[PDB]
RNA sequence: GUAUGUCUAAAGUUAUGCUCUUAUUUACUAACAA
RNA sequence: ACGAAUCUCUUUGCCUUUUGGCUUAGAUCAAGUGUAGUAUCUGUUCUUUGUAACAACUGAAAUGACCUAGGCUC
């Protein structure tokens, strides 16, 4: 029905094709010239005294915490 | 007739994914020593697709009959893809916060992605909780219990019974809940199946 | 079994099928007319057709042997079941 | 109702178990009516 | 019995019509009628499930080839 890509449109045919002679927008001459190189109260409480996983990054969990409620 | 279209925001994803599956397919062919046919690559790439979906779900993708190297490779490639996805999502959400030009469709997509991401995160946390016990130290729990007990002790707080047939309020109470529920449905005239069922109840 | 072995083994077979029962060059044109027995080439043609025919009928029998919906699925489940 | 897609739009190229009769359902469809 | 050929089957090998992308699982799951068509239903009844032998002939018609309308042959 509608199918994955396997054998790409090979520019062999586009080479043997005739020229168009259209003038595209970007092929207008931009940067003509090249550059070059040189060369009491506190007692009474109950309690008185990196990973390479995008789904487990500290940034990530934090982000999720931020952006859910 | 050498049209070739550039990538743009609109067709970026499709192009990405085709490039990905081409890469993966290439890698697998390189690996595979028999020099199998393109039709046997269809099985491979389809396999990959399923794997991706499984990752999206957070259901582990453990197909038995594979060779380990293939399983490795696909795991890698979906991690790459996954990385691309998650980071993209994050970028989008900052973008949305900023209040930038963003596609209504794109914002919905981002919402979806971020939800799936959230669910994945969440159930991973559940797994973590399971895998190495509850965060609460039992001593802490005990302390908490002692505290709460002490509190109600101080209050003479008689607990709430299981509600029998005794109440003069029972009917009244029921009427409140129903009213509350009805409040959802009075506005929206077109209703879902679940909604309809609820209404009927 | 690799296609290396299966070639040589099939080579060995058709040699048993054989075991059952001049060069002239115009170097200016490059045309190497190997005038050989026209009866033997005909015997190749008939034998090779017969070999392909035998194989063709072999599938036909195996196709007529028998959790699915259509022709393809039945076979696709058979591709799963063989594993 | 449309995209869209087919169709037509005229001139003759020199060879010797069943048939039947009906009534009912359900489904789908319907720029047809309500 | 060994060698070979032909045929059938069985075991394996070969997959021999044997899953051909991506997205927010791409998204959302209904309140209909009569009129017509189409199919599908089900019932419904009945129906029904010239030939041989004997006796006889082996062949017709056309116009043209011989002889003097007639007579045989092809």
Swiss-Prot record, chain A:
It is found in: Nucleus. One of its GO terms (molecular function) is RNA binding. The keyword Coiled coil applies. GO terms for biological process: mRNA cis splicing, via spliceosome; mRNA splicing, via spliceosome. Its main location: nucleus. Residues 1-17 are annotated as: Disordered. One of its GO terms (cellular component) is U2-type spliceosomal complex. It comes from the Eukaryota. Pfam families: Cwf_Cwc_15. The keyword Coiled coil applies. Keywords: Coiled coil, mRNA processing, mRNA splicing, Nucleus, Spliceosome. Belongs to the CWC15 family. Belongs to the CWC complex (or CEF1-associated complex), a spliceosome sub-complex reminiscent of a late-stage spliceosome composed of the U2, U5 and U6 snRNAs and at least BUD13, BRR2, CDC40, CEF1, CLF1, CUS1, CWC2, CWC15, CWC21, CWC22, CWC23, CWC24, CWC25, CWC27, ECM2, HSH155, IST3, ISY1, LEA1, MSL1, NTC20, PRP8, PRP9, PRP11, PRP19, PRP21, PRP22, PRP45, PRP46, SLU7, SMB1, SMD1, SMD2, SMD3, SMX2, SMX3, SNT309, SNU114, SPP2, SYF1, SYF2, RSE1 and YJU2. Involved in pre-mRNA splicing. This is Pre-mRNA-splicing factor CWC15. It comes from Saccharomyces cerevisiae (strain ATCC 204508 / S288c) (Baker's yeast). The lineage of its organism: Eukaryota, Fungi, Dikarya, Ascomycota, Saccharomycotina.
From Swiss-Prot, chain B:
It is found in: Nucleus. The MPN (JAB/Mov34) domain has structural similarity with deubiquitinating enzymes, but lacks the residues that would bind the catalytic metal ion. Functions as a scaffold that mediates the ordered assembly of spliceosomal proteins and snRNAs. Required for association of BRR2 with the spliceosomal U5 snRNP, and the subsequent assembly of the U4/U6-U5 tri-snRNP complex. Functions as a scaffold that positions spliceosomal U2, U5 and U6 snRNAs at splice sites on pre-mRNA substrates, so that splicing can occur. Interacts with both the 5' and the 3' splice site, as well as the branch region. Has a role in branch site-3' splice site selection. Associates with the branch site-3' splice 3'-exon region. Also has a role in cell cycle. Component of the U4/U6-U5 tri-snRNP complex composed of the U4, U6 and U5 snRNAs and at least PRP3, PRP4, PRP6, PRP8, PRP18, PRP31, PRP38, SNU13, SNU23, SNU66, SNU114, SPP381, SMB1, SMD1, SMD2, SMD3, SMX2, SMX3, LSM2, LSM3, LSM4, LSM5, LSM6, LSM7, LSM8, BRR2 and DIB1. Present with 468 molecules/cell in log phase SD medium. This is Pre-mRNA-splicing factor 8. It comes from Saccharomyces cerevisiae (strain ATCC 204508 / S288c). The gene is PRP8. The chain holds residues 739 to 939 of 2413 of the full protein.
From Swiss-Prot, chain C:
It is found in: Nucleus. Transmembrane segments: none annotated. Its main location: nucleus. Keywords: mRNA processing, mRNA splicing, Nucleus, Phosphoprotein, Spliceosome. GO terms for cellular component: cytosol; nucleus; Prp19 complex; U2-type catalytic step 1 spliceosome; U2-type catalytic step 2 spliceosome; U2-type post-mRNA release spliceosomal complex; U2-type prespliceosome. One of its GO terms (biological process) is mRNA splicing, via spliceosome. Signal peptide: none annotated. Belongs to the SYF2 family. Belongs to the NTC complex (or PRP19-associated complex), composed of at least CEF1, CLF1, ISY1, NTC20, SNT309, SYF1, SYF2, and PRP19. Involved in pre-mRNA splicing and cell cycle control. As a component of the NTC complex (or PRP19-associated complex), associates to the spliceosome to mediate conformational rearrangement or to stabilize the structure of the spliceosome after U4 snRNA dissociation, which leads to spliceosome maturation. The cell cycle arrest of SYF2 defective cells may be due to the inefficient splicing of TUB1. Present with 1670 molecules/cell in log phase SD medium. This is Pre-mRNA-splicing factor SYF2.
């Amino acid at each position: 029905s509608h199918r994955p890509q396997l054998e790409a449109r090979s520019g062999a045919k586009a080479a043997a094709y005739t020229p168009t002679g259209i003038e595209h927008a970007r092929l207008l001459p931009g940067h003509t010239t090249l550059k070059y190189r040189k060369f009491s109260w506190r007692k009474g409480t109950a309690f008185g005294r990196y990973i390479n996983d995008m789904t487990k990054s500290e940034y990530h969990q934090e982000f999720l915490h931020k952006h859910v409620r | 007739n050498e049209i070739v279209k550039t990538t743009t925001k609109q067709r970026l994803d499709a192009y990405y994914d085709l490039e990905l599956r081409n890469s993966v397919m290439d890698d697998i062919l390189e690996m595979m020593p028999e020099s199998i046919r393109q039709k046997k690559a269809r099985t491979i790439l389809q396999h990959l697709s399923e794997a991706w979906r499984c990752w999206k779900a957070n259901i582990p993708w453990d197909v038995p009959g594979m060779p380990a190297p293939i399983k490795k490779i696909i795991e890698r490639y979906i991690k790459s893809k996954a990385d691309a996805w998650v980071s993209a999502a994050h970028y989008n959400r900052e973008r949305i916060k900023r209040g930038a030009h963003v596609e209504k469709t794109m914002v919905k997509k981002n919402l979806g992605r971020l939800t799936r991401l959230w669910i994945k995160n969440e159930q991973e946390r559940q797994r973590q909780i399971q895998k190495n016990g509850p965060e609460i130290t039992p001593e802490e729990a005990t302390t908490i219990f002692s505290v709460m007990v002490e509190w109600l002790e101080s209050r003479s707080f008689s607990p709430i019974p299981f509600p029998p047939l005794t109440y003069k309020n029972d009917t009244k109470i029921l009427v409140l809940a129903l009213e509350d529920l009805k409040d959802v449905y009075a506005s929206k005239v077109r209703l879902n199946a679940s909604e309809r069922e609820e209404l009927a109840l | 079994i690799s296609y290396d072995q299966l070639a040589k083994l099939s080579y060995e077979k058709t040699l048993r099928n054989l075991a059952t029962q001049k060069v002239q060059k115009d170097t200016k044109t490059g045309k190497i007319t190997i005038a050989d027995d026209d009866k033997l080439v005909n015997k190749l043609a008939v034998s090779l057709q017969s070999e392909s025919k035998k194989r063709y009928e072999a599938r036909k029998r195996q196709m007529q042997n028998a959790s699915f919906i259509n022709d393809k699925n039945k076979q696709f489940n058979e591709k799963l079941s063989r594993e």
